[PDB]
């Protein structure tokens, strides 16, 4: 279902990962869970969003990710300075800043 904005938002074209069958419109593209854009030539227009987070603030695309915590650092004590946590990816900064959900539009 329509997945919110910065999970579309965030991507950069050139990484935007084809979703829905060719002529997919709009709606059916949204309601397949994928993001639908027009806007940027030469890119899939209907492509998969980012997986999400609890906060919005903590989407963005894993090298996008700038280091809050440390080798170990808590889900807790990350949170404490007010940090994304995400332990899923193996190999990248499991405590990130967030970035102010604004630039998210479709």
């Not at 906060?55 to 915590?69: D, F, L, P, T």
């Not at 807790?76 to 193996?90: L, Q, Y």
Request: proline share 11%; glycine share 6%; charged share 20%.
């Amino acid at each position: 279902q329509k997945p919110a904005a910065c999970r579309c938002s965030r991507q950069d074209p050139k990484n935007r990962v084809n979703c829905g069958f060719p002529g997919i419109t709009s709606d059916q593209c949204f309601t397949s869970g994928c993001c639908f854009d027009s806007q940027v030539p030469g890119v899939p227009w209907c492509f998969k969003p980012l997986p999400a987070q609890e906060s919005e603030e903590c989407v963005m695309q894993v090298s996008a990710r700038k280091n809050c915590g440390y080798p170990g650092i808590s889900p807790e004590d990350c949170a404490a300075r007010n940090c994304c946590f995400s332990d899923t990816i193996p190999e990248v900064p499991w405590c990130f800043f967030p970035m102010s959900v604004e630039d998210c539009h479709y």
